[PDB]
Amino acid sequence: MISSLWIAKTGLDAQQTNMDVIANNLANVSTNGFKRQRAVFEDLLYQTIRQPGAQSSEQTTLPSGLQIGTGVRPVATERLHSQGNLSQTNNSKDVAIKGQGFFQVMLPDGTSAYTRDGSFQVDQNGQLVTAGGFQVQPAITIPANALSITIGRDGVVSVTQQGQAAPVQVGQLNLTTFMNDTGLESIGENLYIETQSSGAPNESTPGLNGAGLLYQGYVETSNVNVAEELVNMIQVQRAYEINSKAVSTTDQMLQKLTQL
Template sequence: MMRSLFSGVSGLRNHQTRMDVIGNNIANVNTVGFKGSRVQFQDVLSQTITGAASAQGNRGGTNPMQVGLGMGLASIDTIFTDGSFQPTGKGTDLSIQGSGFFILGNGAQKIYTRAGNFDFDTDGNYLVPGTGYKVMGWMADNTGVINTAGDVSNIQIPVGAAMPAKASTEITYANNLSADAAIGTTINTSRDVYDSLGNSHEVKQTFVKTGTNTWLGYVQVPDATGAVTNSLREITFNTDGTLASVTNVAMTADPARRTLNFAAAADFKLDNTSVGTTSSHNFTVFGSDGMPHAFKVTFTNTGASSWTYSITDPSSSSTTPIDSGNLTWVGGAYRFGTLAADPTTKSFVAPDGTTYNLNLTNGTAPTAAAAIFNPVATTGAGTTGPVGFTTTGADPMSIALDMDITQFGGSSTVQATGQNGYAAGTLDTTSIDPSGIIVGKFTNGQSQNLAKVALATFNNPAGLNKVGENLFAESNNSGVAQVGESGTGGRGKFNPGTLEMANVDLANEFSNMIITQRGFQANSKIITVTDEMLQELANLKR
């Protein structure tokens, strides 16, 4: 039988295989994540009629004479180039740009795919809806931390997942306190914080300017059950407007904190130089509402050992004194009057209705250009640490105040810009970011990481076995799956809300189909011509 007949048969058979591969490529042109294949041919065994001979003497060498015995398949290769990416508008869809495969779980078995048409089922499993295979990755803990160094598992986001309440531990204050503000200027801001039960509580912060580059910050919590600890802070600024220090200070007990205690030091003296000499000083005291209030006290010399005093609100545009009167040095003391029997302490009522005291006890004799002691109505440095208070039924609150503020000219824009607590909430919606992290949006307005989709790569992805349903399985020649995060170790990145289409190039497939058809036709001619030759051979006996 003629060798060409079998060569033609092998050509027909293998071109048919190539046509089968082309047909499968074209059939899957709209299959999500499909990777096309190509067929490579090779020749097979050759029959040697005459072997090669080396040169000898005057004769040169001769080449071998061989007759090929047909052709065979060299390989059927899967092409893993990226397909185009089609936006779907569905947040659970994913595509991979670059290398890598999604890992799907089927019990103890792991399989792999490039098709990211995923969704959640009634139990919150992230899976392929058509097959039920579950997408694998890493689950976050209760605080949203994802350990990608651990083993992968099925991703499951329970329906109605709860986020427990988190007690606030910090409030951040930002922006500017005006350097142009008058002594006594009051700025108020507030922020809701949350206790361990998730209940909100308003924390009011009042800033009062008490001197050049110096402010007091006072915290109030209207619904606190008991006193607020560490509620008062002295805030100082550098001459370039930057924050210099924030120091806890402690208030004196009531009613002492409502006393302008001028004679708090032995060096309290008034100027006795000449008539008309004035000395003004600012004081901060605390009213019955617990808030700091600044006052300006001006002493004017009216003669030997005699003065007038005037108390005004430095933050008010009114020039009318809150209180005024006469003051003398008589009987070894400063007195509100002219006689040795007149008092050294006097009360006045401020516009807020609080009664304040002026205390001149233990002053020393006036001298020329004397200084006056200028205290704030506090006992000095207080307990360091955060603001503390208690609320009904919840754990005690401890809140640090982060003062990221400045003092420049212009308006005061200081405000509480943030805090780190929140109420309890339930899962409302989910989304997936480009790194593959599934983020949950909860009804309390918080977002938290819930899980992260893993990617697997192989040393030889072309060695994977196609097992149907857009799936691949490991083979002896694919290598072991190398599991990790997207964007690491040569792995690609995710495109949320898109699907990867088939990487089949129709123009190329149609061209290959024509070539394959012509090859098939040519091989069929081999059989036809060989048959005619055999027919002639059979007719020789006639």
């Protein structure tokens, strides 16, 4: 009902969003290939009681005006597409991507999503699918009676059968990049889809045009550091408590005003 109360409400909402972001980052500290998110704010408008630099007299100008802020608005919550660390999972069908790029995947309706995960499995029909049932767009299939599947540093993937004393090539794991990886909007089950903010995807073999490289038998851990999350929790808790105390002070002031 009053300007200070509304400003404090906006501050409380901003701190609540910050705490929610911190909690979400801390929750999936062990998800493979997870990219953390950071919240960015920006202050709202200002009511100008007296125009700054106004012409007070024939020659004198106000060195500074009178402006009252209206609060703080959370402008965005952006993913930080940094480089996650790698671990030794020692699986023939586990791949990690070093650098930048995404593995394409086909949604059941028909569109294409993009992922950073590497836990690749095989469906009942022998097609290379990811955890969740989605299958890679280039449609790589693994034939039966397969001894070992070897994925090179580049996109070539080969399989070995019982005989023939030589590997046979199956397909190419081309990966796609975007002009602005931050603009991709996330969806459930660890996927990303193209939007207007990011550019049109460009597909390439690994190691060319800035794309990364594939490492077989590895997996990429989330880019979340537990050390600074706790201190961020401390700071956000203190800020929230301060805003609540400001609300209390405003309420007490108003009550003592209306006690008349």
